[PDB]
């Protein structure tokens, strides 16, 4: 029907995961804390993953939205992380992180809710194991 207005040649797609190993990948919902209104606002729904690099040897939490495939959470794991269960609700975790999703660092309290409880337990165990591996390197 309508004639084209702009022609774009096909380009290669490079996602920063070729040289990293996926130690975890599960469906989840990510919520960001909104201090101005003091209520949780949905940040997205998608596959949250805990990637680990081989040479640089760093652990990175990554997440992409469902259909648009935008990055809704992306940060590094540090010994100062305080992942802990959320008293209200169930099978949910909360932690503060210097998220680098949109355009720059922002200190955000992220709450992740999984489908069931065993998945959340596995995620917490992997998080703790990554923290311990980072700490023991010293």
């Amino acid at each position: 029907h309508f004639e084209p207005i702009v022609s774009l040649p096909e380009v290669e797609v490079k996602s920063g995961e070729e040289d990293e190993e996926i130690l975890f990948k599960e469906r989840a919902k990510l919520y960001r804390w909104d201090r101005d209104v003091s209520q949780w606002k949905e940040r997205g729904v998608g596959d949250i993953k805990i990637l680990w690099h081989t040479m640089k040897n760093y652990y990175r939490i990554l997440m992409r939205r469902d259909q648009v495939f935008k990055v809704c959470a992306n940060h590094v794991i540090t010994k100062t992380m305080e992942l802990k269960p959320l008293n209200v609700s169930n099978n949910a975790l909360v932690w503060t992180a210097s998220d680098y999703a949109d355009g720059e660092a922002k200190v955000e309290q992220l709450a992740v809710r999984f489908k069931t409880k065993e998945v959340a337990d596995c995620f917490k165990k992997t998080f703790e194991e990554c923290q311990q591996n980072l700490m023991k390197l010293q």
Binding site: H1, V11, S15, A111
Partner: protein, 205 residues
């Protein structure tokens, strides 16, 4: 870069601002705060042909038609006419919005979006939607709440503008974060937020 001024038009209370916010932040603004004038929101998508940007002019549906708002439509290249599935009065106005758009911009990809398809008491049905057949439009059911076909309109508009029928979204060009940085001056404040974070429940329905 590539920019395609998109115009989001529809009756008041249909979900234009909620649609744009769910696209650019992922949240779900369940409060009805009527948009005044026009709001410009850039949405950056990545496709197999590279990155594109849609400058969504979310217009206010409460205003009347006429030339007073033609400033919104000047130099437009794609339009999304949004109507509420659970309200026939809002569907009766789709012809008026289409006429108002084609008055200023004659031939442009126009997508009809039926919003709020997750509610059980549905008034407008797939059989009664006959306007898009008379003209040359693409009709899509969307739901900014449950994320049902909430990116199909943008995909179709990109397909018709770029000119590649087989265009589809690629994952992302996301690279590693620059470096961990913290400011101990405000660090305590951050902790305080967590002390309140655990004291509120997630918006779970």
């Amino acid at each position: 870069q590539v920019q395609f001024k998109l115009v989001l038009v529809g009756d008041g209370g249909t979900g234009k601002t909620t649609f744009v916010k769910r696209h650019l932040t992922g949240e779900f603004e369940k409060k009805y705060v009527a948009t005044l004038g026009v709001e410009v929101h850039p949405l950056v998508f990545h496709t197999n042909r590279g990155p594109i940007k849609f400058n969504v002019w979310d217009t206010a549906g409460l205003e009347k038609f006429g030339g007073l708002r033609d400033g919104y439509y000047i130099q437009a290249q794609c339009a999304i006419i949004m109507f509420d599935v659970t309200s026939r009065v809002t569907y009766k106005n789709v012809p008026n919005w289409h006429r108002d758009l084609v008055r200023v911009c004659e031939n442009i990809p126009i997508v009809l979006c039926g919003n709020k398809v997750d509610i059980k008491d549905r008034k407008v049905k797939a059989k009664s939607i006959v306007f898009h057949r008379k003209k040359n439009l693409q009709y899509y059911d969307i739901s900014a709440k449950s994320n049902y076909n909430f990116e199909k309109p943008f995909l179709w508009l990109a397909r018709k503008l770029i000119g590649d029928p087989n265009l589809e979204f690629v994952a992302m060009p996301a690279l590693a974060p620059p470096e961990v940085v913290m400011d101990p001056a405000l660090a305590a404040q951050y902790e305080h937020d967590l002390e309140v974070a655990q004291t509120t429940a997630l918006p779970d329905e």
